[PDB]
Design an enzyme around this catalytic site. Structure first.
Site, PDB file in Angstrom:
ATOM      1  N   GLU A  35      53.228   3.491  79.943  1.00  0.00           N
ATOM      2  CA  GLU A  35      51.786   3.322  79.941  1.00  0.00           C
ATOM      3  C   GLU A  35      51.423   2.153  80.853  1.00  0.00           C
ATOM      4  OE1 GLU A  35      49.158   4.821  78.845  1.00  0.00           O
ATOM      5  OE2 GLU A  35      50.178   6.415  77.735  1.00  0.00           O
ATOM      6  N   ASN A  46      39.273   4.999  84.063  1.00  0.00           N
ATOM      7  CA  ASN A  46      39.326   6.433  83.801  1.00  0.00           C
ATOM      8  C   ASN A  46      38.065   7.066  84.380  1.00  0.00           C
ATOM      9  OD1 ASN A  46      41.776   6.468  82.141  1.00  0.00           O
ATOM     10  ND2 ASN A  46      40.534   5.411  80.602  1.00  0.00           N
ATOM     11  N   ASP A  48      35.904   9.030  83.056  1.00  0.00           N
ATOM     12  CA  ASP A  48      34.788   9.167  82.118  1.00  0.00           C
ATOM     13  C   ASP A  48      34.029   7.866  81.931  1.00  0.00           C
ATOM     14  OD1 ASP A  48      36.665   8.984  78.921  1.00  0.00           O
ATOM     15  OD2 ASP A  48      36.763   7.627  80.595  1.00  0.00           O
ATOM     16  N   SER A  50      35.510   4.796  81.067  1.00  0.00           N
ATOM     17  CA  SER A  50      36.293   3.868  80.309  1.00  0.00           C
ATOM     18  C   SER A  50      37.418   3.283  81.204  1.00  0.00           C
ATOM     19  CB  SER A  50      36.806   4.488  79.042  1.00  0.00           C
ATOM     20  OG  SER A  50      37.889   5.335  79.116  1.00  0.00           O
ATOM     21  N   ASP A  52      41.401   1.406  80.489  1.00  0.00           N
ATOM     22  CA  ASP A  52      42.556   1.198  79.609  1.00  0.00           C
ATOM     23  C   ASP A  52      43.113  -0.210  79.907  1.00  0.00           C
ATOM     24  OD1 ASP A  52      42.595   4.058  78.688  1.00  0.00           O
ATOM     25  OD2 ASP A  52      43.939   4.476  80.306  1.00  0.00           O
ATOM     26  N   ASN A  59      42.090   2.092  75.178  1.00  0.00           N
ATOM     27  CA  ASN A  59      40.858   2.632  75.690  1.00  0.00           C
ATOM     28  C   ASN A  59      39.577   2.023  75.204  1.00  0.00           C
ATOM     29  OD1 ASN A  59      38.707   4.980  75.781  1.00  0.00           O
ATOM     30  ND2 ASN A  59      39.960   5.170  77.587  1.00  0.00           N
TER      31      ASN A  59
END
Ligand SMILES: *CCS(=O)(=O)[C@@H]1O[C@H](CO)[C@@H](O)[C@H](O)[C@H]1O
Ligand SMILES: *CCS(=O)(=O)[C@@H]1O[C@H](CO)[C@@H](O)[C@H](O)[C@H]1O
Ligand SMILES: *CCS(=O)(=O)[C@@H]1O[C@H](CO)[C@@H](O)[C@H](O)[C@H]1O
Ligand SMILES: *CCS(=O)(=O)[C@@H]1O[C@H](CO)[C@@H](O)[C@H](O)[C@H]1O
EC number: 3.2.1.17
Length: 127
Positions: A35, A46, A48, A50, A52, A59
């Site tokens: 990750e 991301n 959308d 967001s 991380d 998130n």
């Protein structure tokens, strides 16, 4: 801060992640490896809207509040900034909340760790 494999395993064990909800320590180390590449400062945007954050790539939409993500739910009730620390405490505490649908939440874990001998990630470490 970038953790070494065994350094992270030891820290996560100290933090009570070994066998948390049935997931052996190796699962968590493997998840962190793919990750964030063991990087506590990793941040990735991301599509959308967001981001991380941190060691576990937690998130902004669902878990943490960065104050820049529409639809933010902040289910871990923590500022995302707390997830960008050399101290993995906040990330561990939030990760516990996330697994409470299991580790499938972490795409990298499902895609690369699930079904493998994840214990390989802690073998050789002094715990
Ligand atoms: C990750 C911080 S620590 O010092 O390695 C670890 O922190 C937890 C939570 O505060 C303690 O319960 C544990 O004993 C410590 O080793
Ligand atoms: C940080 C670990 S915990 O959530 O405080 C602790 O975890 C163990 C399993 O590792 C559970 O059996 C215990 O009930 C939890 O409180
Ligand atoms: C485990 C999350 S919390 O801090 O116990 C809980 O989080 C929600 C969502 O941010 C808050 O609305 C609630 O007041 C907190 O207790
Ligand atoms: C890892 C210590 S914690 O985050 O405070 C831990 O969280 C779990 C799940 O939210 C609780 O069940 C446990 O009692 C807490 O200590």
């Amino acid at each position: 801060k970038v953790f070494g494999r065994c350094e992270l395993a030891a820290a996560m064990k100290r933090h009570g992640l070994d066998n948390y909800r049935g997931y052996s320590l190796g699962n968590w180390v493997c998840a962190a490896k793919f990750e964030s590449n063991f990087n506590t400062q990793a941040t990735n945007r991301n599509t959308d809207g967001s981001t991380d954050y941190g060691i576990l790539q937690i998130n902004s939409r669902w878990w943490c509040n960065d104050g820049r993500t529409p639809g933010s739910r902040n289910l871990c009730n923590i500022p995302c900034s707390a997830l960008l620390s050399s101290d993995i405490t906040a990330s561990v505490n939030c990760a516990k909340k996330i697994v409470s649908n299991g580790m499938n939440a972490w795409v990298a874990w499902r895609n690369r760790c699930k079904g493998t001998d994840v214990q390989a990630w802690i073998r050789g470490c002094r715990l």
